Design a protein around this ligand. Structure first.
Ligand SMILES: CC(=O)SCCNC(=O)CCNC(=O)[C@H](O)C(C)(C)COP(=O)(O)OP(=O)(O)OC[C@H]1O[C@@H](n2cnc3c(N)ncnc32)[C@H](O)[C@@H]1OP(=O)(O)O
Ligand SMILES: [Zn+2]
Lengths: 265, 24
């Protein structure tokens, strides 16, 4: 079974089983087109494929661009096959992905990095078109080669940026994997410390903060507590402004909102 | 409203009430 995948110039170890056809899933290695995400049995097949394949980026629309860094919005109804391949690809690095086959109700936000051969996949997140639970991310992943460089954070940030622009608040779909939780804590703490740094008033509601960041109140409260910034007193709750933490908090690993060009689908 | 624990105590907090931002 699948231990490795060739992806562009990288050779990547898989963490988890993913349900590819047993035709493919009985091999040890799997050869992927880095641009259209077709999976193949051998180098020599991949090689002929790259000679035929016209794609140099993901389908859909490019809704963020800042130099070499893009995000594309791909509709799972319009690009059913690309989105499926991407879900299969992701299950190799997620313990549990809820859905693979049915990508129609999803939009896929594919972040890339451009070099002279094309726009290379850094990572993605999926979004329900219409979430009863107001989840603004279903699944998020940064590819192994790109992990721990700040990209996942840009992705998360970009999810809440779409939320601001839609005038919604959002949260990631429960349950969070452990790397997901570590990543969302770091993001949320940062959003909170940033907010308080710029805020000058003597009081705020959790709701105001939620309305401004598009972060969910329970996620805010939850982070305040992780930060031991929620205190109790008289018979009311106070927010403790930890300056040690704010100044702790002070490589182009940011999403710049003036580089978004988007209408909600 | 939302529930959690602080300094060994159960607490419950509003998300609409203004909370005193405080220092020491
Ligand atoms: C709702 C969901 O979809 S939950 C499922 C989430 N997806 C996964 O688990 C798939 C596998 N995981 C991933 O793809 C990635 O770990 C992601 C997307 C969660 C994070 O991507 P990355 O690009 O590595 O995150 P990024 O580099 O921005 O770092 C995010 C934070 O997590 C920390 N971090 C990332 N990986 C680790 C790790 N392996 N161990 C400890 N901390 C880590 C970083 O230190 C950083 O925090 P800090 O700024 O406070 O130092
Ligand atoms: Zn291809």
């Amino acid at each position: 079974m699948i231990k490795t995948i060739a992806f562009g110039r990288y050779e990547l170890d898989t963490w988890y089983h993913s349900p590819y056809p047993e035709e493919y899933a009985r091999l040890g290695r799997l050869y992927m087109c880095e641009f259209c995400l077709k999976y193949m049995k051998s180098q020599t097949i991949l090689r002929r494929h790259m000679a035929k394949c016209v794609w140099k980026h993901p389908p859909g629309d490019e809704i963020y661009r800042k130099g070499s860094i893009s995000v594309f919005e791909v509709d799972g109804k319009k690009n059913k096959i690309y989105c499926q391949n991407l879900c299969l690809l992701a299950k190799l690095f997620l313990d549990h992905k809820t859905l693979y086959y049915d990508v129609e109700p999803f939009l896929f936000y594919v972040m890339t990095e451009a070099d002279n051969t094309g726009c290379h996949l850094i990572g993605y997140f999926s979004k329900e078109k219409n979430s009863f639970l107001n989840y603004n991310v279903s699944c998020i992943l940064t590819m192994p080669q790109y992990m721990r460089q700040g990209y996942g954070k840009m992705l998360i940030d970009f999810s809440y940026l779409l939320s601001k622009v839609e005038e919604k608040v959002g949260s990631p779909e429960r349950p969070l994997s452990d790397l997901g939780l570590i990543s969302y804590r770091s993001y949320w703490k940062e959003v909170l410390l940033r907010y308080l740094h710029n805020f000058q008033g003597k009081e705020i509601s959790i709701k105001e903060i939620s309305q401004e960041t598009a972060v969910n109140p329970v996620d805010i409260v939850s982070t305040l507590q992780a930060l031991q910034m929620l205190k109790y007193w008289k018979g009311k709750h106070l927010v403790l402004k930890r300056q040690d933490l704010i100044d702790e908090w002070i490589s182009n690993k940011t999403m710049d909102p003036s580089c978004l060009k988007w209408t909600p689908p | 409203m939302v529930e959690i624990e602080i300094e060994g105590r159960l607490h419950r907090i509003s998300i609409f009430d203004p909370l005193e931002i405080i220092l020491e």
